RNA sequence: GCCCUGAAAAUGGAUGGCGCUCAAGCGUGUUACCUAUACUCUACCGUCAGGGUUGAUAUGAUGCCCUGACGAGUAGGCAGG
């Protein structure tokens, strides 16, 4: 009641709970899930071989 | 051309000094040699730029790795400690 929700507004005048700029806090889950992994080029080596 | 006269200033003194006379002087030529924080190569430090790298079961993604170039400095500005 004191801070409000999606049903009770805030119990404070003109106040709403803050919104998120990103829907999840796990960036690794987004990268690997289904769609980015099908649109990205194959990976490298994580360390380049010293040439010449 | 060289040398000499012309050419006299005050502490004792200045091709830098010693000294040098078919020079160790002058003009000119042939080479050899001496080595600067310059150049070339290599290592390391930092800076800048271009790239690679979030796959899960490990520790830093302002992280790690690759490659190239660069490095003077008062007044002054900025950054990291």
Residue A30: nearest nucleotide (C-alpha to C1')? B54
Please count the other Cβ atoms lying within 10 Å of the Cβ belonging to residue A15. Answer: 10
First to last CA, chain A: 68
Q: What is the resolution of this structure in A?
A: 2.4
> Is the Cβ–Cβ distance between A11 and A4 less than 8 Å?
yes
Question: Which region, left, alpha or beta, applies to residue A46 given φ > 0 means left and ψ of -120 to 50 means alpha?
Answer: left
Q: Name the method of structure determination.
A: cryo-EM
| Nucleotides in chain B with any atom closer than 7 Å to protein CB | 51-56, 61, 64-67
Distance A52 CA to B43 C1' (A): 17
Tokens of A26: 């796990």
Distance A44 CA to B53 C1' (A): 7
- CA dist A1 and A8 (Å) reads 7
The three-state DSSP-derived secondary structure of chain A is: CCCCCCCCCCCCCCCCCCCCCCCCCCHHHHHHCCCHHHHCCCCCCCCCCCCC
């Amino acid at each position: 009641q004191v801070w409000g929700s999606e049903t009770v507004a805030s119990s404070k005048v003109g106040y709403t709970l803050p919104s998120h700029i990103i829907s999840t806090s796990d960036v690794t889950r987004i990268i690997n899930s289904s769609e980015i992994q099908s649109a990205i080029r194959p990976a490298g080596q994580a360390t380049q071989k010293r040439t010449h």
